[PDB]
């Protein structure tokens, strides 16, 4: 009984993972827009905040390479409220 029921559960899991693969292109596409939008929302505020400091280059990278480097949590939410940062940092870990 367990053998047949477990094999059915594997067929169900494949069905649930197929649904994920059907949506990953859409979720991936809108993640990139969200991430790039938040970086430009920090580049603009960087220009206004850092304008009298001498030698500052707004949007200067910290890497020698020009390759795209995935930002860390700090770069994205550098200028944002605590509530929207806690969920983006400890939202999953603390969810029951």
Partner 1 sequence: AERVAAFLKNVWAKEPVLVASFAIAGLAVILPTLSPYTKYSLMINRATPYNYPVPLRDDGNMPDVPSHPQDPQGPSLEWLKRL
Partner 2 sequence: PFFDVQKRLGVDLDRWMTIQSAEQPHKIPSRCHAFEKEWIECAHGIGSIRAEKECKIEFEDFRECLLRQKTMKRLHAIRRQREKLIKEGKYTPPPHHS
Partner 3 sequence: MWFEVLPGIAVMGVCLFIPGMATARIHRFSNGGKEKRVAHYPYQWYLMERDRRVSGVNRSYVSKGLENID
Ligand X SMILES: CCCCCCCCCCCCCCCCCC(=O)OC[C@H](COP(=O)([O-])OCC[N+](C)(C)C)OC(=O)CCCCCCCCCCCCCCCCC
Interface positions with ligand X (CB under 6 A): 92-96
Give the DSSP H/E element, type plus range, for residue 43. helix 2-49
- Which of residues 24 and 43 has its CB atom nearest to partner 1 in the complex? 24
From the list ligand X, partner 3, partner 2, none, pick the one residue 76 interacts with, judged by a Cβ distance below 5 to 8 Å according to partner type.
Answer: none
**SS3 of 84, please?**
helix
Among 73, 86, 90, 91, binds partner 3 (CB under 8 A): 91
Scanning 5-13, 19-27, 28-36, 68-76 for contacts with partner 2 by CB under 8 A, the matching segment is 68-76
Q: Counting Cβ atoms within 10 Å, is residue 93 exposed (0-12), middle (13-18) or buried (19+)?
A: exposed
- Whole-number Å distance between alpha carbons of 73 and 89: 8
Interface residue with partner 3 among 22, 27, 29, 53 (CB under 8 A) is 27
């Amino acid at each position: 009984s367990m053998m047949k029921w477990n094999r059915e559960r594997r067929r169900l899991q494949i069905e649930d993972f197929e649904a994920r693969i059907a949506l990953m292109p859409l979720l991936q596409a809108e993640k990139d827009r969200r991430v790039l939008q938040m970086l430009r929302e920090n580049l603009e505020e960087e220009a206004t905040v850092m304008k009298d400091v001498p030698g500052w280059k707004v949007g200067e990278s910290v890497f020698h390479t020009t390759r795209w480097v995935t930002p860390m949590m700090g770069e994205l939410y550098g200028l944002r409220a605590s509530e929207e940062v806690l969920s983006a940092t400890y939202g999953f870990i603390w969810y029951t």
